[PDB]
Structure formats: C-alpha cells, structure tokens
Structure 1
Amino acid sequence: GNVDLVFLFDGSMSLQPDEFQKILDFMKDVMKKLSNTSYQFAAVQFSTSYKTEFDFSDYVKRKDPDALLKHVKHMLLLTNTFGAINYVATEVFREELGARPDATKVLIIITDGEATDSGNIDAAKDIIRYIIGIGKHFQTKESQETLHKFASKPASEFVKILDTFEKLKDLFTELQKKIYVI
C-alpha cells in the first residue's frame, strides 16, 4: 500500500501572499493527516523553471511538514506545466531521491493558470495525475477543460476546479471522507 505522492504547485499569478499561503497550508494539512502511514511525500514548485522544495528522502528524515515548507519562496514568473510534469517524472520519481520502486506514483498538480508551454507528458504515463485549477483564470467551462489533458481519466474524478484559494480548506475536508486511516 505504499504511495509516493508529489505536490507540484504554481502560484505565480495569485500574487497575494494570503492566497499562496493557502496552497502551503493545504499540503501541510494532507501530510499531517497521513503522517506515519506508508505514504511518502515530495513537493516541487514551478513557474518558468522547477524547484524541488523537498524530496522523499528529506520527508523521511524530518517528517515535519512545517519544517519542510519553512523556506518556500513565492515564484512569480510563468506557468510551464508541461515542463514541470516532465521534471517530476524524470527528476523526482527517482530512487536516488528516496522514491520507492514498488510504490504507486501520484502527482497532485495545483495551478492558477493555463500552461505557458507545449509538449507532451508521455514520460508521466505511469503516474496517477490529479489537477486542481484555482481562481479567476478557470471561471469559464472552456478554461477548465484545458486542464483535462494533464490529468488522468476520467476528468470527473481527477480534475478539481475551485473558484477561490479559500476553498482549498473545504476540498481538504471533502478528501478526508474518502480515506480511512487505521
């Protein structure tokens, strides 16, 4: 039942410090809920480039979500989502960085914008992909459907649309009902 779960998040266009911090609180909430399970976590911030904020090895060593995310700085550039997914698949889901070859791979993508690059995510086909689109750039049904190409299928399971960053707490509340932690 081992799961290696990566958070991949961009808040470049949700400038407000309060909004960006809600992204961080959401990841903290999830990790706290799943501490001392067979889940291991990593997190990657993306904008124009990609930064591993902590890898799986760091999680096992420090296992304190507050400490792991203490030094995160808000990147304010673009939204290179194709590049970011390929980065995670080729750089983060790697055994040298503490990833477990036996584990189920789950990628949680958190974005406030449509992608500013193009490409494919063929490298990520063995990864279960959820995407959360947040805020005013996803108010139209059209903009929401552009996120389907990044997510696993069906989109009704793997694509979540939130109208405000305040709604991450309510998404967390609803996710908790789908797990039972022994």
Structure 2
Amino acid sequence: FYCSRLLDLVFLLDGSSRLSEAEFEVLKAFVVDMMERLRISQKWVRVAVVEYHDGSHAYIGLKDRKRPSELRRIASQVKYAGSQVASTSEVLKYTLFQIFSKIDRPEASRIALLLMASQEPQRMSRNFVRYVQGLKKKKVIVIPVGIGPHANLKQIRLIEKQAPENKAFVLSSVDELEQQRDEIVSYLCDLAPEAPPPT
C-alpha cells in the first residue's frame, strides 16, 4: 500500500559477491519499490541508503533534502561492489555511530532494514551483538532480511533473540523479494506511529 507514518527507515544492502551484478540490481529495484510505497518527507518517512562491504558506503542520508524521485534515482544507481566481504558488524556499527549517533527525532520509529545475503568473516563478528544491543538501547528496530542460501542464519536468529521487535524475513532468492514487498512494507509501517505530536 502506501505508508504515511513517522518513520526513519534505513536500507542496508549487502555488497558482497554472493550477489551477482544482476541479482544486486534486483535488490536495488526492491529498495526503489519500497520507496515508492513510502511517504518520503522530513515529517513522515525518512530514508537512508547504504551499500556495505568491508565498509559502509552511504548514498542517501535521513536528512537529505531532495525530491523523492531524485532519491529513487540515486537509490537505483547504487554502484555494485561484489566484495569478498560484506561486514554486518561494520554496517551495524556504522548505523549506530554515524546514522543514529543522536536521536533527533523521538516522535518517530527507527528501523534498520538489514538486507543480507552472505556471511562475514567470524573474526569481524567479535563485537556484533554489542552493536545490535547498542541499537536496541537507542530504540532502533533491526529487521534482518535473509536473501539466498548464504545469508548468515546464525546472526539473523541472533538479531531476533536480541529484541522483541526484531523480526527476520528469510527469503530463498532475490526473486522472492518482489513477491514479499507488500508484506514487508506493511510490517514495517505498523511499527511506526501514525500521528505527530500535538505541537
């Protein structure tokens, strides 16, 4: 449908080589479709787009004052990485420290849509749960989205085990996205308040 609520949504795209050139474009299209079903505004739904590999490469910020159509273009032109490493620990650390360093919008919900499709090196996962728990303390909901046979199930279930609102969406392939979009959007929307503060 169309989400018109106070929400800060953060898209986190796995940049590993697990996803092919094409398969990644599909993921991007999914993110674009999501955005078409969101009321993009500083006072309603704010969006952020981040392709992550060894590190986080942000294309869109929550405070970016741009026309939604423009943002959709940007989100569709996200460059393919195809890295050997897509650190979820790093992208969650980035989200926690860079994106949500300061909670400037209490009146809205904070959601991190973690689109993963691989397994990061175990040594990198050392402080993983600490970032997830750290996001929780800033009241940021993390929704893992498993894509493909290589998506780290252990971490995904570990995210759910961290917070009540943290639900996972285990998928079979990037094709399962389009036919799961509507369900996901509505789920995220129902986590955000509908009406602003009295002001």
TM-score by length of 1: 0.82
**What runs of 5+ residues in structure 2 fail to find an aligned partner?**
195-199
Query: In the TM superposition, what is the alpha-carbon distance from 1:113 to its structure 2 partner?
Result: 0.9
Partner of 2:18: 14
Match of 2:53 among 47, 51, 55: 47
RMSD: 2.6
Matched, 1:5 2:9: yes
Aligned length in residues: 173
Name the SS of the counterpart of 2:16 in structure 1. Answer: coil
Structure 1 segments (4+ residues) deviating >6 Å: none
Query: In the TM superposition, what is the alpha-carbon distance from 1:106 to its structure 2 partner?
Result: 0.6
Of structures 1 and 2, the one with the larger relative CO (CA 8 A, separation 6+) is: 2
Partner of 1:160: 169
Write the distance in 1 (CA, Å) between the matches of 2:89 and 2:107: 25
Partner of 2:180: 171
The aligned amino acid for 1:45 is: E
Maintained 8 Å contact 1:13/1:112:
no
Deviations 1:139-161 (A, max 9, x none): xxxx5243122345458x71111
The aligned amino acid for 1:113 is: S
Maintained 8 Å contact 1:10/1:79:
yes
Deviations 1:90-132 (A, max 9, x none): 1112569xx6343211100001112322112132112111001
Q: Aligned in 2, Cα 1:71/1:175: closer, same or farther, shift over 3 Å? A: closer
Name the SS of the counterpart of 2:28 in structure 1. Answer: helix
Matches within 5 A, 1:81-100: 81-94=88-101, 100=105
The structure with more helix, counted as a fraction of residues: 1
